[PDB]
Design a protein around this ligand. Structure first.
Ligand SMILES: CC(C)c1cccc(CNC[C@@H](O)[C@@H]2C[C@H](C)CCCCCN([C@H](C)c3ccccc3)C(=O)c3cc(cc(-c4ncco4)c3)C(=O)N2)c1
Length: 377
C-alpha cells in the first residue's frame, strides 16, 4: 500500500523537504520538514513573519498541556516552546492516528525560513537526543508503539521545486534500482554510521579512517551540505581544487560564501571529481561505497544578475561536530532507515541527477580490514 506515499514530499530548492500532516481535533493541516538529524516534533504555535499558518492549541479538543517548557538549539537555528500532546495524522502516509508529543513553538531564532512553505519539524532520530531529555518520546516511536506500522521508514529526496517520498513502514521497490547495501547504525541517538574509506576520483585520501568519523558521522536529512571534520575537509578541498585547477574560483567560493557562474549549458562538470564514501558493511571485513557526483555538491542558485548563467554554491563545508551526510549525499540515493534491524540501506535512487558520462553508484562488496578502528571513542 506504499503507492499512496510515493511523492508525498515537497519543497522549494534549498529550503527543506516537507510532508503534510494534521494535528488536533478537528484536524489542522501543517507542512512539516522531515529531519533525520534530530528527534523533536515541533510546530509553530504563534504568529511569525515567515509563518502563514500555525498550530492553534485552543481550537483542538484533544490538546493536552504537559505544563513543561522545551528549547532546541540546532547547528543553525533554534526555538523554544511549550510541550503538550495531541492527535496527529499523515494524510499521504499510513491510515492511522497517534497521540504524539508536540512542542508548541512560541519563540524562535533563525529557524523558520521565508517562503519555505513549512511550519514545523519532524525529528525522526532517537529519544537519546530528544529535548529536554530522552523521556520525551519521539514521533516515530509513538507511531510504532500505538499502531501496526513496522519499525522502519525510507527517504527518497529528489533535488532540483523539489520533491520525493517518505515511505512510512516499509520499502517501495519501484523507487530505486540495483541492490540495497546496508551499514550498521552504530548507536541509536543520531543515525550514526562509520565511514571506513574516502576516495576522490578513485584516489584514496589515505587518512587514518578515524578522522572521517571524528567525533561522529551522521545521516541528516535536515542539513543541506556534506559537512566534514576540519582535517578531512581540508584534504577534500585540496583534492577538488587540484582536479578543477583548469578554472579559477574566489577563495570565498570554497567557503560557500561566493557563487560561481558559467554561460547556460557550459558548466564544466567534467573537471569536478566524484567522491566515494565507503561505509561499514553487514559482514566481517566487508564494506560498500556510495559515489557522489559534482552535480550533488555544486548546488544551483539564483543568478543574482539578469542573465541566464548557471550559478552554483559549493556545498561541502567544514564541521566541528563530525561528518554530516546531508541532502547533498541523500539526494542521490534511496535511503532505508531500518530501525528494526539497526541498519541503514542505500540504493541508487530512481530520481538521481544525470551526468553525461558518469553515474552515482552504490557498489559492493569491498574488503576492508579493521573497520572497528574507524569508530571514534
Ligand atoms: C537538536 C540536536 C539533536 C542537534 C544539534 C546540533 C546538530 C544536530 C544535527 N542535525 C541538525 C538538524 O536537525 C537541523 C534541522 C534544521 C533546524 C531544520 C530547519 C532548517 C534547515 C536549514 N537548511 C536548509 C533549509 C535545508 C535544505 C534542504 C534540506 C535540509 C535543510 C540547512 O541546510 C541547514 C540545517 C542545519 C545546519 C546547516 C549548516 N550548514 C553549515 C552549518 O550548519 C544547514 C541544521 O542545523 N539542521 C542536531
Amino acid at each position: 500500500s506504499f503507492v499512496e506515499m510515493v511523492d508525498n514530499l515537497r519543497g522549494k530548492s534549498g529550503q527543506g523537504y516537507y510532508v503534510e500532516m494534521t494535528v488536533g481535533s478537528p484536524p489542522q493541516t501543517l507542512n512539516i520538514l522531515v529531519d533525520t538529524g534530530s528527534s523533536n516534533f515541533a510546530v509553530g504555535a504563534a504568529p511569525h513573519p515567515f509563518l502563514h499558518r500555525y498550530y492553534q492549541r485552543q481550537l483542538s479538543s484533544t490538546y493536552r498541556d504537559l505544563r513543561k517548557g522545551v528549547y532546541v538549539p540546532y547547528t543553525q537555528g533554534k526555538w523554544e516552546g511549550e510541550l503538550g500532546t495531541d492527535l496527529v495524522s499523515i494524510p499521504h502516509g499510513p491510515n492511522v492516528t497517534v497521540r504524539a508529543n508536540i512542542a508548541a513553538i512560541t519563540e524562535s531564532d533563525k529557524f523558520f525560513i521565508n517562503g519555505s512553505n513549512w511550519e514545523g519539524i519532524l525529528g525522526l532520530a532517537y529519544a537519546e537526543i530528544a529535548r529536554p531529555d530522552d523521556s520525551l518520546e519521539p514521533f516515530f516511536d509513538s507511531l510504532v508503539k500505538q499502531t501496526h506500522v513496522p519499525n522502519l521508514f525510507s527517504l527518497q529526496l529528489c533535488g532540483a521545486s523539489v520533491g520525493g517520498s517518505m515511505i512510512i513502514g516499509g520499502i517501495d521497490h519501484s523507487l530505486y534500482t540495483g541492490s540495497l547495501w546496508y551499514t550498521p547504525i552504530r548507536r541509536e541517538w543520531y543515525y550514526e554510521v562509520i565511514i571506513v574509506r574516502v576516495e576522490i576520483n578513485g584516489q584514496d585520501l589515505k587518512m587514518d579512517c578515524k578522522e572521517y568519523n571524528y567525533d561522529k558521522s551522521i545521516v541528516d536529512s535536515g542539513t543541506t551540505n556534506l559537512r566534514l571534520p576540519k582535517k578531512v575537509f581540508e584534504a577534500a578541498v585540496k583534492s577538488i581544487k587540484a582536479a578543477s585547477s583548469t578554472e579559477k574560483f574566489p577563495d570565498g567560493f570554497w567557503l560557500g560564501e561566493q557563487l560561481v557562474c558559467w554561460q547556460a549549458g557550459t558548466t564544466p562538470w567534467n573537471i569536478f571529481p566524484v567522491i566515494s564514501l565507503y561505509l561499514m558493511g553487514e559482514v566481517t571485513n566487508q564494506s560498500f561505497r556510495i559515489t557522489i557526483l559534482p552535480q550533488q555538491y555544486l548546488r544551483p542558485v539564483e543568478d543574482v544578475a539578469t542573465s541566464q548563467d548557471d550559478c552554483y554554491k559549493f556545498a561541502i563545508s567544514q564541521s566541528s561536530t563530525g561528518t554530516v551526510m546531508g541532502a547533498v549525499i541523500m539526494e542521490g540515493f534511496y535511503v532505508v532507515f531500518d530501525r528494526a534491524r539497526k541498519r541503514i540501506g542505500f540504493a541508487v535512487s530512481a530520481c538521481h541527477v544525470h551526468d553525461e558520462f558518469r553515474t552515482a553508484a552504490v557498489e559492493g562488496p569491498f574488503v576492508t580490514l579493521d573497520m572497528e578502528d574507524c569508530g571514534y571513542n
